[PDB]
């Protein structure tokens, strides 16, 4: 059910490519790309939460993303996933996006901010769906054959595949300090702030409102946000709180792998001619098609080849 | 197909971290010295080395 994200918030994470070729800390970042399904469907895990907005109410039209120490909402219609051409997103829930993507070498997930700015994260990822059957086809045909395969279903129920969410670490921020003539002033904007200084009064402390510390420089003080009222996924892209894990939350991973049938095409009838102990087959493949043959005696003498163009073979 | 589970790394600054051996299927743990990680808001913590 959608009621799992009640006390969870999205998180900013390091991204190797933010669109301009430079790594940066993005609201959206790719954690894991799962392609266990054999029909090509991709389950992409991102730091965003889709389908649940702020104020903790389910809404399929909105997603929520961390902006600056606090989440904010955006419209889902701006979400895009691409490898080399835009992908068709078949589903979304929380941190997980179910999409279908063309063959490619990278994977970029992005959206539009509330301030009408674009955010995107790009990860190197070799996407190439495995061949189902003996024909390398590009889209399911009108007329053909059915073969077993595995896909990601649309179901968002609990799947006993579980992901841990625990209390996020202290969030450092250099913006919290303003220098005025040797006085470091710490703003709060509504969040508890830890500070530690080696100037003036070297005594570190904790605030909930603005403070000023005299005879100090912005260089020699540290600030962070500590009172975190929501817990986030223990992603490998955020530091841990202590030697042990906080645990304290759990989220089911939706779209379980399920066990279906895929449609594959059947090649055209080849033109067959006969000769003395010889069969001359002229073949018209629309797409790379496997041709194999064997003897039915004691020696199979199996032979195979991928026919890609109109070809005459004598067997 | 296997999946690699990686809990969040432990950044212990102004100190030295350590971990204990576990009995997980293929468990690997290590401590790296002299790291100075940054977050989106800046450096994670003061002590520079």
């Amino acid at each position, epitope marked *: 059910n959608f009621n799992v994200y009640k006390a969870t918030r999205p998180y900013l994470a390091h991204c190797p490519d933010c669109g301009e070729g430079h790594s940066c800390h993005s609201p959206v970042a790719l954690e894991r790309i799962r392609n266990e399904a054999t029909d090509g469907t991709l389950k992409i895990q991102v730091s965003l939460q889709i389908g649940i907005k702020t104020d903790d109410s389910h809404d399929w039209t909105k997603l929520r993303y961390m902006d600056n120490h606090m989440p904010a909402d955006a419209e889902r219609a701006g979400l895009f996933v691409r490898t080399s051409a835009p992908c068709t997103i078949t589903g979304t829930m929380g941190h997980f996006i179910l999409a279908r993507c063309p063959k490619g070498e990278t994977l970029t997930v992005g959206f539009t901010d509330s301030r009408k700015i674009s955010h995107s994260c790009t990860h190197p990822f070799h996407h190439d769906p495995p061949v189902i059957g003996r024909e390398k086809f590009h889209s399911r045909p009108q007329h053909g054959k059915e073969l077993p395969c595995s896909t990601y279903v649309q179901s968002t129920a609990a799947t006993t595949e579980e992901i841990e969410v625990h*209390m996020p670490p202290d969030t450092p921020d250099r913006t919290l300090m303003s220098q005025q003539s040797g006085n470091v002033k710490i703003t*709060v904007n*509504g969040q*508890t702030v830890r500070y*530690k200084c080696n100037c003036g009064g070297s*005594n*570190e*402390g*904790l*605030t*909930t*409102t603005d*403070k000023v510390i005299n005879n100090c420089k912005v260089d020699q003080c540290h600030a962070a946000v*500590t*009172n*975190h*009222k929501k817990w986030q996924y223990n992603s490998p892209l955020v530091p841990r*709180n*202590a*030697e*042990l894990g*906080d*645990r*304290k939350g759990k989220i089911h991973i939706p779209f379980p792998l399920a066990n279906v049938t895929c449609r594959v095409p059947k090649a055209r009838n080849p033109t067959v001619t006969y000769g003395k102990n010889q069969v001359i087959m002229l073949l018209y493949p629309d797409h790379p098609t496997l041709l194999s043959y064997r003897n039915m005696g004691e020696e199979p003498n199996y032979q195979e080849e991928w026919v890609m163009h109109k070809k005459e073979v004598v067997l | 197909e296997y999946k690699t589970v990686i809990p969040s790394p432990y950044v212990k600054c*102004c*100190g030295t971290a350590e971990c204990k051996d576990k009995n997980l299927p293929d468990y690997s743990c290590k401590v790296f010295t002299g790291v100075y990680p940054f977050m989106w808001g800046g450096a994670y913590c003061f002590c520079d080395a």
Partner: antibody
Amino acid sequence: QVQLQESGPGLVKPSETLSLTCTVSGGSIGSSSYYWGWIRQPPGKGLQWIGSFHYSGTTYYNPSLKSRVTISVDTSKNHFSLKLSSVTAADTAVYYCASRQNWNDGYFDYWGQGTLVTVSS
Amino acid sequence: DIQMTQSPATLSLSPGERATLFCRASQSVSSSLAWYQQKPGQAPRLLIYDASNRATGIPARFSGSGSGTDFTLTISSLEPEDFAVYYCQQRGNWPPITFGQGTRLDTKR
């Protein structure tokens, strides 16, 4: 959930070292994100704060008493201890050990059974 | 430092009636105020944190409100078990962590 139990001499002399050890039950030091600390209240007065210990390695002390107040933790036998040196008669008060299990702030919501500390006579 | 003053120093009011207590701050602490209960022979007990909501096991009879430098604690009805000495604590700027001097709650006679 978790419980606190204080232990100490109770009666001290002038210039003597006061040591109070609070042992934790139903839990351990290596636990979720929260604080430890010690509180004291003179009879007929409000509560006064001595110090607090955060598991991250930092310690916080009351500036008026920070010069003598030392807070340590023994994770092996699983307690935290407060030491006040050169205790004077003005420090006679009921002491408690405390912690704030939830939300990791400066408040307190768990307690032991505090003991009276008298210094003179 | 920041100092809290409670009002009244002593309050006497009959069981089963609505009660009100005031805590005033020397400096604005937003909502960083906690309302605390203590009984003779008992350790202090937390009732309200951040001047809102309530800790686990604390019923709805206590209601905290206020902001800035002025905060109020409202008791919908005093049952016979609710008579104790109450305190207000600020955490807006600590160390040191500051508590109120205490208000005495009595039953009117």
